Amino acid sequence: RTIVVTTILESPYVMYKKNHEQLEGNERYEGYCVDLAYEIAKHVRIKYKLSIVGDGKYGARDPETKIWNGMVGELVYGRADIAVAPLTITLVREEVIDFSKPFMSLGISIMIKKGTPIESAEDLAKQTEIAYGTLDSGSTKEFFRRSKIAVYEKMWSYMKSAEPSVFTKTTADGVARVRKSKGKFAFLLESTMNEYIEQRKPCDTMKVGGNLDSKGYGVATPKGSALGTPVNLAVLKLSEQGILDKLKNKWWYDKGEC
Template identity: 60%
Template structure:
């Protein structure tokens, strides 16, 4: 979104061939400073990094260092290493390093999806509570005289008919009573003793709370689309090996990991520099394409502004996960000691 060719750029000339945020920014800076300018794209397509062996600079930074350009208006990150050889204006945009992954598929409902509204631990507690209440009700009925049928045998009843049980709340009837209450269906028997009714009342209140919570959560689960992301932070990336991750080659993001002294980032850099095949990409579009083609097996580390922009563009199959790994800004660059430095800074 910073610098792009117009659709009909082949029929246009000069600065009219380009459009984007940085193109508009360059135009406004030129108006405030009172200069004429010509936009050009760097040949290698890089922002600028120093070769550790030859100590030479490439990309836009190299164009400024070696006098082939007067101003660099681009999403050029302000870093300490770059400020040693070029001057930066105040940041015109704040950002940070972020993680891009392929958007996971929406989870399909399974056979046991009805269990999702409550956690596994909650379901286990309900099962144990159900068994516990049934056992307590059984024991209470055993010890309470009000639960026993002590009436004399009816003489008119058929002698072949089995006699009524002396106590309605055997272990199986106790389980049936608790299950009927939990399912909000009731039961054909009920406790007659005070202690039994207290146990039953407590169980009814418990089931009322559980059923109400379950119903509310079930409605939310049915209306909200759920997606499960395998990665949520840089720590998640560092502690696994199934998903590869990399950065733009010859850029500030790569330099950030190379120079970082934080244990997590040192571990990530150790993986990236030794990974085979290489996890570094030449351009941002190459990194985005690799994320899309990898079927969730590659994460791209890039600036949050670009990450958020791509996430909102069709085909909308990438997403930003977690927070930013650092905080920095984009600045307009000029050669070291250039007379344009102060006017450009004031214009920004």
């Protein structure tokens, strides 16, 4: 009866409230996805419990062990009824889970430290003085592993074999490494996170270029779940009433410290 909503700690989507550690259940969290889960549950009329995924990963299938980890895995093996998160709608995932139409548009972007002499993906691919990496084990990393485009083929070639590891267990680790690297590390991350950080102190980073691709986040359910339909109509409705567009403004630009 109570729906398990799997989710991940990623700002500004799901974040601990100023005084969690002092609260319980869904009270402990806040963010875009928290508000979104709340809206969806209201229109779908369910009680739900937010659960932060254990391994803190998004979802990939190990090639040797064939097992799905992360949020996707929680759905695939039934431990979660629905994931509300910045979960990218990719082809491999859609074969094993279900996705609503996107609730947010985005694309892979480049985040530099202010004053870095990089404007584009080519600017980065045609040099070695500035290191650059991506979040680990996610759709951004995969974008490059798979690309058949010259420049992205160049980039994946550099990153795939870079010492130390240019990937990062987390978004914050990439951001941190951009801030601490005196303009000698560009981070490749999804435009939405990039845009969020750009409005946070010490306001020393910035989005350069246009996006490398296009894609969306979907609310995801297990393949064949009875919840799939209501959930999709719910997201579309929130879209049509401007809600998503009201929620984006709130967590990105009103929280803006610059």
